């Protein structure tokens, strides 16, 4: 992926310069992206915009299906993030205070039409989880990666 090459390039060099690291293994990287649409139509829309079959999340009457979700990591996650940065985001900037206090970020999209690939426009949420130990470190890494903060 283009973002994968960007991260393997001096992006990590920027993180090391700005946070004074002693090894390249302590440079934070995005662990995964979990897309949750909180239902055949919703499952199909999520699958067609993401790429894989979603997982139906039941309730903890209890036990009924309520939402759907997808986890991405590796080449697919990197391609998804590049597509979200380039093709998808401007159709919908973004909150820079929505941090977990540990280094993971969450963003909610209300209309699914902002994806290149509906009768009732439902809203989904994206969680980008990284190996960053601080909100500051995660935000700096994401901004370097190109998040439209």
């Amino acid at each position: 992926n283009r973002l994968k090459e960007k991260f393997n390039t001096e992006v990590t060099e920027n993180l090391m310069k700005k946070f004074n690291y002693s090894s390249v293994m302590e440079v934070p990287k995005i662990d995964k992206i979990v897309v949750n649409m909180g239902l055949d139509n919703a499952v199909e829309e999520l699958e067609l915009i993401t790429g894989q079959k979603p997982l139906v999340t039941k309730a903890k009457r209890e036990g009924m299906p309520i939402g759907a979700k997808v986890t991405l990591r590796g080449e697919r996650m990197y391609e998804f993030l590049d597509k979200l940065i380039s093709v998808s985001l401007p159709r919908v900037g973004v909150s820079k205070k929505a941090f977990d206090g540990r280094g993971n970020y969450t963003l909610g999209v209300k209309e699914q039409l902002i994806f290149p690939e509906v009768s009732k426009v439902r809203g989904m949420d994206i969680v980008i989880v990284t190996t960053a130990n601080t909100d500051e470190e995660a935000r700096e890494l994401l901004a370097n990666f190109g998040m439209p903060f």
Binding site: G51, Q52, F80, D82, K83, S86, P116, E117
Partner: protein
């Protein structure tokens, strides 16, 4: 992965999607919004709007 989704080309750049053009790589892929310049000048302001309307310098 269990056993569509290819590498379509959306400027131009490679990407993966399901909503399915030669490249420098030599292969072809399936191929509005460049998002805003200043676009429009901001509001003049009431004093400037008043002075310009009546020519009062």
């Amino acid at each position: 992965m269990k056993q569509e989704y290819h590498q379509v080309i959306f400027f131009k750049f490679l990407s993966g999607s399901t909503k399915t053009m030669e490249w420098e790589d030599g292969k072809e892929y399936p191929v509005d919004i460049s998002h805003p310049r200043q676009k429009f000048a901001a509001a003049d302001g009431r004093v400037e709007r008043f002075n310009k309307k009546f020519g009062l310098k």
